[model samples]
Each structure stands twice: as C-alpha cells, then as structure tokens.
Target chain A: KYRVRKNVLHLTDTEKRDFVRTVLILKEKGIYDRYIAWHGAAGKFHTPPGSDRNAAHMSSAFLPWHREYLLRFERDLQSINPEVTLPYWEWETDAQMQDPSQSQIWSADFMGGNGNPIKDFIVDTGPFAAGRWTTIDEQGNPSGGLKRNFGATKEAPTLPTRDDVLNALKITQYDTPPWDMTSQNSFRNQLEGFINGPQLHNRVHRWVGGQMGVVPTAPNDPVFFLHHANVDRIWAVWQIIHRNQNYQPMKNGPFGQNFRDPMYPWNTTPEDVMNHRKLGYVYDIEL
Target chain B: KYRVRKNVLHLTDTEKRDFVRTVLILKEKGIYDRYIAWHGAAGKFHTPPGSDRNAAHMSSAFLPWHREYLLRFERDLQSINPEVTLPYWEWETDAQMQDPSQSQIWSADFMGGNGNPIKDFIVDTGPFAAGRWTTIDEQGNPSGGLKRNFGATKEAPTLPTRDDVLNALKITQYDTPPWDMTSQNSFRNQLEGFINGPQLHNRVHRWVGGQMGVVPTAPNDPVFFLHHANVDRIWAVWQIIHRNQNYQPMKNGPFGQNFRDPMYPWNTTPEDVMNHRKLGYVYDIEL
Candidate 1:
C-alpha cells in the first residue's frame, strides 16, 4: 500500500500539527460536518425496521462502514493538504500508562485534555476547546461545545487492555449468524466490544465519555476518527492474519450485513472494502 | 430527456400500481429509508453552523439540492425497475378541488387517504398506512407509522394556488444577497415559499400535515418526493423563462449557498444539477 497510516504516538510534532490544521480547514469549508451527519444517519437506519442492526454499527457492517467513513474523511483531509493522512489513536497501548489521560495524544497542542469539571465537562484545553470548536447534538442542532469525561463511567473505568485486542483478533470467523452484537466468536462482534458487553471498541467509547460515549454524538469529538482509525487498524491486522477468511453472511443475513449489501447512507458494500491494501492504504504495523 | 416524469392525475391505473409496488420493493430492500435519512441529515446540517441556512432548504441551494435528491432517488428507482420514474403531485391544480383531500392522489390505492382522527392522525387506508409502513423520528428511531392530517394547520389550511406558482416564476433573479429565507424578489426564495411565509412549497408540506409538516420527518411520506417534483418542475419552468439569469452568488455567498459549493451530505453542487435535461429527466409539461 502506498499511503501509510502511522500510530498517533509515533507522529512527529509537525505531522500532528499538519493533521490538525487540515481537519480544521475541512471543518471551516463545511466538509467535516458531512462525516458527522453521515455517521448519525447510518446509525438510525436499521437494516430492517424494528431491528437493532443498523447500517453503521451493532452489526456485521460496522467495520466496513467505519472503514469507508474513515477513507472518505482521509480523502477530504488529503484534498486540503495532500501530505495529510488519518492516524490511529492506539488506545490499547495508552492503557498501560498510570494516567492514560497524560498521553501525548491528549496534549494541549493536539486533541486537547479532558473537560474541565467547573465548566460542566466542556473540553477547555487544546485545539477543540469549547469556544474554539463547535459541536452538534443528536438532533443535529448546535451543541454549545465539545465535552469529555474520561473514565467517568463505573463500567468502563479504564482503557481496553492490549490483550483484549489480541483476544479479539484470535476470533476465527469474520462474523457469526444473527450478525449482531449477540454474535459469539465473531471477530466483528468481539472487536466491536459487545461480547462481554463493551469490552473493546464499545469500552473505549464509554471510557472516553461525553460525545464519544454515544453513537449519534460520537463524531463530534475529533478523536472519534482517530479512535476508529485504531479500530480499523486492528481489523486490518486481523485480515492479514486470517488471509483465508472472508467477510461473513455471504447470504441469508440482514439486508445490510450481507457481503454484497450496500451499507445505508452510502452504496459501499463490505466486499468493496474487504482489502484495505487495495484501497491504497495500510497501517504502520503492517509494514 | 430520456426519462419522463408525469403528473399524478394523468397516470393510468397500472402506472400508479407499478409506482406503489416499486416503492414498496425499495422500502423492503432497505433502500427507501436512505432517502429519508439523507433528507433529515441535510436539514440539520446548517451551512456554516448556528445559521438558519441549511444544505437543503431556506437557502439559495434549495432548488438544486432537491434536484440532486430527486435525481438520486430516480436513479435508485430505475435500478429496481427501469420503467419507473418519479411523478409530480401537481398540488396547485388539486388546490382548486372542493376538498383537496379527495384528490385522486390521496385515494386509498395511491398515496393513501387522510390521517384518521380516531387513531391520532395515522394514515390507515392505503399502501403506506400505519401497519404497512413504518416511520422514524428526528432522532432516527422508529416512530411507529406514517401519519397525515391534511389541511389541519391553521396557517396552511389549503394548498398553494396555480397563481402562486406563476408569480414565483415571474421573479427575475435566481437569488440575491443574504441568500436566505429573507432574500427578496429572489426566485429561489419565492419558490421555496418564504415570501409570504409557507406559500407554495411550504404550504403543500403543512397541508399534508403529520410527518410532512416538519423538515426532518417530511421524507417519511412518499408524497414528499412527489411534492418536491412539482416544485422542481416549477423551477425548471422558471429556468427556461429566465435563460439569461444564472444562480446567484456564484461567489461571495456562504460556503454552501454559492453556485459551485458542494451541498452538504453530497458532493453534487448547485451547478451540477442546474440543467434538468442534462441530468436526463423532464416533466410531462416540458415535452
């Protein structure tokens, strides 16, 4: 793959600055909100009405949907500055620190620190502080500011461990029958962090509470993309290890979960993005 | 144009049945909800945020946004059955009826009859009645079923008259400075129905009531597309008559309202869909 996505921790200061600048430009140009609205739209679009499986998450299409979402966002970033590429947060590694919040990713120059308690959980530090950046509510109205409450939830007291990621990668099948959060032994479900109930991907969202804590409002935080880029990287690693494996539900699943089914809010199917390398990008670990 | 969109009144019985059947197929296949969600997404995505101007309505891009929306929908319908094309409701002519609710468009076999008062305004007499079709709220969750209470609102107790359409066409400029709902003598604002506040396009929406009464939930009713088709047809007529005038604020307008700015939730610009015939579609009257 020609385009390489690096670990957030590995990025030099200039790289981080460039990435942030490009994203801000995209936001100023009215392109960044499109991704947020798209993510929200897909979450509400259940595969069949009254079902839990949506076009974006809580289903087999989750990985592919976010993959396409990140790809498009990365392209938008590249449009503004050709050198820019999306970087992964790698929260699993950040979990080892005594204070995960102290990681360079949360520095004032980049994504900013956690929300100030006195200001009512409003992010008040780095580039995306309350006054500096704008946010939208679930209904798509102007939410005054970006908010965060790290490790605030009792359920997700800390970041997901590195072993948690390895165990999920050990999953043999891409996804299982029913193809939902309940699917056992499904790599899609395991990494989605719903197996033992929010153990991995879902756990991260809860740990970094605030907008990132919920599905519809998650992308309001700039880190949502970075977090998903990590999730996508883990999936890419799994794809490499399981070269013989393919996306699940080639037939007889929900309308959107099937291999060739078009994910709502966009026509891209899981089959279309099965090979990350073919999409012209690879995670740094792959190299 | 190769694709001919017809008037609902002139459609043969078989044509109506085919149109209904095709829409049901799209809904069953999980394609129809994408249109609904797209409409909702565009509504909430304010052009520059914290502004009343959105990618879809109450702005200079309204006409072109719907033009692209209808084009995508028509293409999706064509994908299912090449013979099917979107038809215009022609609400202006229906407005002259003693009871506009009794128009053929609201027949039990077509778009469905009025919302039953006994059941809290739920449409119970046609293909998309409560039990047959489902609806989603502003937040994207299932809202039970399609509902309509035609002419229920005091402000929009009747559909816009034919003279309303003729008068909008009489405007010379496409849009003016401010480029919003308050824009005066602007063809875009006049047709979008903010001139006298909820006149033509807005009147039809409020007249239909239920989900049609609100911007976010309007697309849940299949009639939204048909109503917009008539709106689009009127704009097409205006475009032909005012051949010298072009879309306003080719520059100096807000990021999205400009002639070439990409409409949110889509890359298609106002310029992209400016020519209806170039997009391979025309109204029955155009022929």
Candidate 2:
C-alpha cells in the first residue's frame, strides 16, 4: 500500500442535485440524451464514469457526457441563435479528434454552472470523480476530447462470444506442452480450462445480461481494470520464465485482434503487445 | 468547487492491475462462467452493483463503497474456490432486510468504515474522501439491504425518443418549445401551467416519455433520482405557497385511478402552460 491516496470528485448533496438538474437541462436541449426512450442518446453508452458501464463498454464511452455538457451549452445557443441541436461529432471512430475551441460549451464559461443563479434554490457542488485516468486540460475544458489516458494496453472491445463453439473446443482442441497455455499454466488454460481457465472467461464474459460478448471483463468491469492489472501481474511473473513477454495471439478472427486496443494498435505494432501490457504497471522487478 | 477532491481510491497502477487479475482469477474458478456464457449475458439489461446501485439511495450512500468492497471479498472467494459466484440479495422488491451477521460482512467485532483500506482502491471509492459507511448491526444490527432514502423522493424518469414509441407518440407531431428553459420570472408562468397549481409534487410525475418527454425512462438512470428529487422539491414549494398543496385526481378507470400525462389523460385542475419544460436549470428550492 502506498502512503498517499487517489484523488476524487466529491459533490455536496446539493452539488449532486444540481448536476442532475443540469443533465435534465441538457436532455431538454437535445443534448446527449438517451438514444431511444428505452435507450439513451446516440452517444450515451459512456455517461457514468467507471468500469462494467457500457456492454462491458460496447457503444459509448467518455464522449456522451461531453455531448450532454454541450447540450447544457445549447441552452446558451438557444438564448442567442435558437437554431441548432448540439452537434455531436463522433471522434473515436472518426478520422480526427474534434476540437473544442469553436464549440458551444465554451459559451457558458462566463455564466455559472447552474442555469440561472437566482431562481435556483438548491444544488450541491457535485459528485466529481474520475476513474483510472490522468488529464492535461483544466476543469471543464472542452479539450477533454484530446485528453490522453495515462493508462494501459488492453484492447477490450465488445467482441462476440460463441459458447457453442467454445463448448465444441472443450472436448477436443488446443495444443500441448509447457508452452501450450492449455498445458494448464497458460492464461488460456486459465480461461478455457476445466476448472479455472476458459470457463471463468465464459462465466463472466456475458454478465451484462442479454447480449453476446458484451459483458465487460474484469478491468472493463471497472473491477476488471484492477483485476486485469493483477492478471497482468500474474503474466508478468510468467514472462520472467518465458524470457519473452510479447503478446502473440494465433492469427485468426477475434483472437488475433487483442492488440488493437489503444496506442499499441494505432501507435505501436504486433510485437509491442509483449512489452506494452508489461510496461506502465512496470514493477519493482528492477528494484 | 472547494479544494475538496474525490479520487477517493487511488491504487497505484500496481494495485489497480493486481485487483483486476484477482477478479479474473475468480473468473477462472467461477461456476457462473458457463452459465453466463451459455446465457449470452449481454442482450438483456445487466444491473451492476444492483437496485441499490440504480435506485436504492440509502445510508449505503453513507458508505458509498460498502457493497463494492464486499464484491472484492467475493472476488477473493472466486480466486480461492474457482467455482464460486458472487451471491446477490435483492431487497428493493423484497420484503425483509438481509440478516447482517448471516455473512462475514457484518461481525460483532467488525469495524466497517472506521478504516482507510476500503476507501482507497484503484477503482471507484467515495464518501468524497477517506471514509467508509458503517455496518447496520454488529451482532446483527442492520448493515445490508435497501436503506429507505428518507431524504429522497420518487424521481421523474427521462426517456430517449424511441423508434417504437416514436410512432406511438407521433413525436414529429408537436412543435418544439421555444427556449431550452423558461426565464426566471417566466419560470412562474411556465410552472403555473403544470396540471396543478405551483408545487413540486405536481411537476415530478412519472409518465411515459412523449413529445419532448422522450421515452425509455428506465428507473435505472441515476438521473431518475435527481428528477424525482426536484419533483419532491416542487411539492415542498407548493406546500409552502399555500398552507398545503393537495389535490388528488378523480377516478377515471374502473377503480378510481386516472391521472393523464400533461399531453393527454391529465386534467383534474387548471394551471398555466409553460411548465418545467419552459424553465431552464433552476433547482429545487427544498433540500
């Protein structure tokens, strides 16, 4: 355990109330509301800040709240222009990151966070907090879009899980040996094994409820981020024995794509998975 | 806005990762793995933490991380047992509260939130800073289960415009409101138009989302909490406006049960037109 502590965003009960009301204002303004009456706004998959949030994080992420935040600004635009629903530019899947300079959120910089200070009777300061992430921009900076995550390398995509196929493989499939994860010591063995391997992955892979591979994993589960951090720990030990700590999923469908998550994918290469997941949480192994 | 920060739990990257892998180990040992995999855990709604998470705003809010921390213990069990699945006890729709001492969670000698460890994980942690909630009972007092939020009231749920309901409501049929919110002074006119006289209770009514109401207002959205909080605020305000704000509706259906939405079936009294829809982000005057 370290001496210091993790920072948090605490809101007074009043702040909590105010923030929720603020969201309503955003919803009314056609900001990032839900996608459907049953669902939320198009980019709502990421509103709450944590793990196990989206379909283990399927559709949206950090962007939806920003959309709602922008909607709060649309109220400002309505006071002035009255002609635009807050424009949502899907940046993650899109080519370029959307800039905030000319956006609507900037409009309320002068005005207070509460829509109208006078008629407003009560509102706490907030339920302010962030999960495992560090940012460069200042508070409420629209530039949060460009904010880089001071995090790790897990391409936790919302993949499809076929239990039938996995079951078929259960009786007869996989390589053998000390290196063969199926040999029992392997992570795959841990996932697909009779006891602690594949079944565990299968157990939690669909915890989200009704979908396919949408259930978030440990880190993706919010618990998963920390859980995987430890999983990475276990692997770190294994890498010591193997001497080579690179990720090498056999070329194929989804298995071949675990490396496509973050900077490792868009920024690094296949050989990088070996050291990447092994990087940041870099241990005192050297110490 | 004060110097109050709330990244309450700050596990170093090491702690974060370690915890994640531990849960994964639980996955490895889990019996639920095949069940979840077989069920396809995604397509349906997955409730995280539980109803307490989505709806129960109780004293547990006093100890925000209590249940989650307990989940950490469950992960421990999974790591050790390999076939264990975290057991959940639903209390909302259920009647009696769960027995505290029935599990290890509440021990007579158990000192719940008085410590520092629980509030400092790498994942979510709160109470704003370093604090955990207390156990309901030591020798079986009242630690777990839905703690009625005396402070909270039913919230108005927000709905997204759904495709199926869109056809039902004919959303494109109505004209959008002029501004995102009613002006402060205009707020009076807007609120007065509510189905009843000026009162928070009158405003915070649950209804299927329509027109600007949007739909799919799942009780799960945290926004549901705030929406009702504000509604309760309106009723409190109305109570103060007159000696009391009470006007029960007439019985329209077979048994005397009929309160239409503002758009239709709602007409027991007279009020203004520009209601909350016209008002901007003014908050509940009550606590």
Candidate 3:
C-alpha cells in the first residue's frame, strides 16, 4: 500500500517530465487554483479581522495539516497519471551548490529560470514561464505566467542546511500552545520553521519568492508539491526517531492539540494520519 | 554616547530590581501606551489596507525599525532610571535548565510563572500577577493583570542557542523583498524569526505565552524589553559579522527601503537607526 516518494534531485528526465506535466494539467483544469485559494481562505492564524483564527498554516497543526494537504494533492495528481507520485526537492544540495540559480532545477530544461528581465517577475524561460502558463491568485483572479527571482536576494542557504535539520531533531516534544504561531520546541514548530531551528519549511518558500512567498497563492508554483513532499519526509524521519514517544498530540489542550479533535474540512483528527505509513506512503530515504 | 546593554541572565539582583521598578513605573504612567498600539495599527507588512502593502515590519526595515522602536523604549526607561539599561534575557540557559518555572526570572520577586488557573490566563505569581498590574491592548482597552503560561507548554530550546546565533551570523544581507515573514537568509528575517533560522526572537514570545503570545499586548508583560534587548544584541552581533555590508535596507524598492521614508510615529528611516552606536547602545557581550 505504500507509495514511493522520490527526491527530485535524483529523478530521471522522464520522471521529471511526467511530474511537471501532471502538475500543469492540474493547474489548467482549475483544480490547482482551488487548493491555492484554500490557503488564502483558511488564511493562516493571524490576530484578528479575518475569521478562522485556527487556520492550519501558522499553527502547531502545521505539520499534520500540511502532511494531509500534500497527500490530498498527491492523490489528485496520481488520479490523472496513476504512476506519478510527488518528488521531493532536497534543496540543501542546491544550498551548498556554488550558484543556486544556476542549478539544474532552475534551468530552461527543468522548471525554468527566474522572472524575465524586461517583463519583470514573469517567468521567462522555464516550462511554467510566461506565455507557456498562467495561474490563479487567491482572489480567483488569473494571471499570465509564474514568477520567481531565484538567487536575487539571499541566494546561499536558500534551503535549510543539514545542521539546521539536526538542530530540529534534537527537540523532543510535538507542540505547545496557543498551538498557533506561538508554539516552540515542538517538532511541528521546528519543522514548520516557526521555531526557526532549521528554517526547514519556510526558507524554501522565501527562496522561491514572488508567488511562493505569499501563502494564499503559494501553491501556484509547481515546485510547491516537491518542496512539501520533502517536508513530509522530514516529519516521517522525525516520527521514526521519536518512535518511543506517542507520535501524535494526545493531550487535550483547549486549542485543538487533542488527537481526537476534528481537523476541519477533513473528517479526521491528527490521530488518523500521524504516521506516513498509516497514510499509505513512505519516503525512499530515511533520515 | 552608547549605553552598555547587559543580559538579564547575568544581571545582579539589584540590577534586576532596578529594571523591574523602572518598567512598573513606565506602565503605571501612560508612556508605555504609545508603543503597544503601533504593532496593531501599523499592522505588520501582511495586509494592504494602509496602502503600504509593504509595511515597516515583515519588510526590509524590520531590523532598524525595531531597533529604533526599542531605543525609544530604552530612552523612556532611562528617563525613569539612568542606570537601568534594558537587560537581555539570554534565555537559552532556561531552556536547558531542569525546570524553567523554578528559574529566578519567574520567581515571586520577578516576572512570574503561569497564569492563575481559576482566573483564566491571568498570571498568579511574580511581579505582574493578577492583582499587581494592568496594561493596554491594541485598541487601548484596559485589562487588569498581566497573563502568562510559562512552562505550561514547550520549554526546551526556549531561546536561540549560541549555535543558533552563530548560524544566524552567517546570513549576509540585511533583508530582501516581500520582506516581512518570507525573506530567507536575511539577517533581519532570521533575527525576527520570520524565516525561522536560529529561532532567535519569536521563540521567547511563544515560550512566555498568554500576554506574550498576543503580539499587540506583549510589551505589557515587561519582559518584552529584556527579550528584545537580546534580539537587539543579536542584530548588533549580526551587523558586526557582516562588517563589510551597510546596515539598513540599501537597495531601493517601492516600499520604505530607503533613507527618506518615515517609520511612522518615529519620523525616521531605516538608515537613521542602522548603527547601534548612533542609537546609543552596545551589548555587554561583543558577539
């Protein structure tokens, strides 16, 4: 029942092509925009004004929430191309590379390079470049082409280093409250990059700036799945290491930390999918 | 002209006493009211309502802006007690310590421990507890007693470690575009804990919980200054490490990345407070 998840770093040309094609198909069919808008509508756990203060993005549920979110996206992708499972971008390799912008992932043959110089942020040469693709914003407004400014601002360490992840692994607990953005020392907070241990998940979003930097519209970037799959892999690795401890949030804190508490839109609690194997998938590599 | 800032962790009992006395005096007076409201009305760089879709925070100016903000508070504190320079927390020790609630900082004589279970999150012990203090909210609402849930949740790695600080020292740039929470490898973003590198600043806020967890009302907790002093010290340290690069936002962007743009109520720009020496402060620990 376990599906194989491959790192994009090791993916063959045909595998990469199939994954990219599947992603584009989803985008063109309006399914991709639906999920992008979900992040906007769920809209993170900001202070006030907008409702749903418990939006999964910035909360301790960040880990399991995104784990399920990515799984759903994978299911959708696999539906179109049964053989296609999402690939992980082990971005640290690129971080250690001399010029991250010059990495194979950003070339014309892959996802394509940064925004067009003359046209501003419109992706110029990539497969998802302007004229070749368009995307929907959080507001459902459509725009021509993807955008990126790879290596434009802070290029080195665009992804968290192994040391950063190691630091994250040192933490023992799963989460604390107000289980939103304030949780610290929790593996969820650490991996979510809220605790800032490794800069694990958040750094990739910032490095692939423009659309990816904005939460509501981030999924428009085809790389989002690959990036998240890697994050999911990290969670799996963390779970295995912390196997002695109960993996899920078993405590009944007022702020949805309970394993039995319902995760909205999904009929399941965090207990349902705490393990990657339980969710019917396993990463190709262990931590 | 620079004041020598010391970590509160190393402060003598008398020094801690003097600092706490000054903070209580400021709160007792109306002087502290101005700063707490700014984080709310100024509303970080997230929203577009103010027309500065890119605001002072979350943008490139986060470091210098907060530097000036903290300096103004320090000046106010100094006005009350000249010898009471803001003390940094250096809170990492508490994270590793056996029981944080047993730490001196949370004792009855100091900032206090968890909230009163019966009175909700109103703090039960220490200086700012239930009957002893009252503070302002974002809308200027009067709230009796400060709130804290210290050690109620995650406590390990309560503050950034020496290694975390060292890792942060490696980030070369001050900030990059979409500057708020998404800028990676930016010393400003890292220190701000937005890009989540070393977990420098935000962890303390979350670890303290309750009032500290609430952003607009955090300053009311009194420990805000000490925590910020440590953050300010980190900025100073990062500035020293990236000695060749100028502090503040050097690149010109649409938002307030230049020398002329006003940082709201302060009427200063990022360039104005780039240097700690110019702002009249230096940390006790060099880097």
**Highest-scoring model, lDDT:** 1
Q: Each prediction's Cα lDDT score?
A: 0.90, 0.23, 0.68
Give the distance in Å from residue A172's predicted Cα in candidate 2 to where it truly belongs.
18
Per-residue lDDT over B1-287 for candidate 3, one digit per residue giving the tens place of the 0 to 100 score:
46888866677888878877888787665455445654443343322223333344556666666777788889889999888788777776666666666767776766777777788878877777777777655544566778877645554235555677677778877766655567766777787776543266776777777777766578778787778777777777777777887754554553344555555433477777877887777888763
Per-candidate TM-score against the hidden true structure: 0.96, 0.20, 0.48
DockQ of 3: 0.01
- What is the C-alpha lDDT profile of model 1 across B1-287, one tens digit per residue? 99999999999999899899999998888788888888988887787677898889989989999999999999989998899999999998998998998899988778999999999999999999998998888766789999999898899999999988888889999998799989998989888889988899988899899999998899999999999999999999998999999998899888888889888778888889999999999899977
> Which one wins by lDDT: 1 or 3?
1
Point out the worst 10-residue segment of candidate 3 chain B by lDDT.
Answer: B44-53
Worst 10 residues of 2 chain A by lDDT: A144-153
**Candidate 1 stretches greater than 4 Å from native:** none
The DockQ of each candidate is 0.62, 0.01, 0.01
Off by over 4 Å in 3: A44-53, A154-157, A196-198, A254-257, B1-287
Taking every candidate in turn, the Cα RMSD to the unseen true structure, in Å, is 1.7, 24.2, 21.4
Least accurate 10 contiguous residues by lDDT in model 1 chain A: A41-50
- Residues A1-287, candidate 2, lDDT per residue (tens digit)? 11111111222334334433443443343222111111211112221112122211121111121222222233443443433222221111111224322222112221012112232311111221122211111111111111111111133222213442233234221222222322443343443322332243333332211111232111111112211322333333445555633343233212112333211001222334444223222333323
Preferred candidate (TM-score higher): 1 or 2: 1
For all candidates in order, state the fraction of native interface contacts they contain: 0.67, 0.00, 0.00
- Ranking the candidates on TM-score from highest down gives 1, 3, 2
